[PDB]
Amino acid sequence: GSHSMRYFYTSVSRPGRGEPRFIAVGYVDDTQFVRFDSDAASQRMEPRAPWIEQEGPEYWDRNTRNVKAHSQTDRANLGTLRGYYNQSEDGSHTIQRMYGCDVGPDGRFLRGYQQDAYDGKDYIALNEDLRSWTAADMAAQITQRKWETAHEAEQWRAYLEGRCVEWLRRYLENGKETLQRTDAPKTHMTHHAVSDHEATLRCWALSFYPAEITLTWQRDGEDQTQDTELVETRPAGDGTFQKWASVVVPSGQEQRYTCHVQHEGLPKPLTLRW
């Protein structure tokens, strides 16, 4: 189908505690493949998926240099923003940055992304035309004018339409056996009695990839949300994902309820019934 590459950067100032901590992680679809930690001993970008290890030493030198440079700039930017917002030297603050690109199933560029947040709220983001910015407030407007003057959108557009998608395509080829797989959910249902009057049905999806899935309960063929519980999709730790959905039903009416499972790895959606 379509695929994506994303980098996620987090810088946190640690006032009194020393110098800011920087963490970078890279993903293709729902699979992490690199990390960099400003606190770790290696001071290198590190592999976190098997297929990225077939990149040679120049790749690791270059990605280490560039991600270190990004970390240094975000260190600068923590001091800059505390000035812009008239904040004290005392509190801890957070810069988050996400960027990346999507490709379609034939590998062609679909869209590119760059967005930054300060203390959890939108700060500045590149617009979809990859030529202009959306600034969230007056402080971000200061940054906007510096970046429009420096033609920074040209650099971002060049990367997002060029190197980003070219390397994303390369990863999908190098990691075809895992990135281009679909693992269909392994499903089952559990049944536990609350009282004489009610029971819980819990509909499970396990060992699936990618993470996108839909679990819905119906009663007599009608969608049901009352007295249901859906948990957030969660990692199993082995590269696959898990989810469940439960419903509280009157005892002896279990046959009226169906759980419906939709996932890319299923030719047709599944219906489970107790």
Binding site: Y7, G26, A76, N77, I142, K146, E152, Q155
Partner: peptide, 12 residues
């Protein structure tokens, strides 16, 4: 592959 910036890119 991370963004390849100018030395002075992305300064707030």
């Amino acid at each position: 592959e991370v963004f390849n910036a100018t030395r002075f890119a992305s300064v707030y």
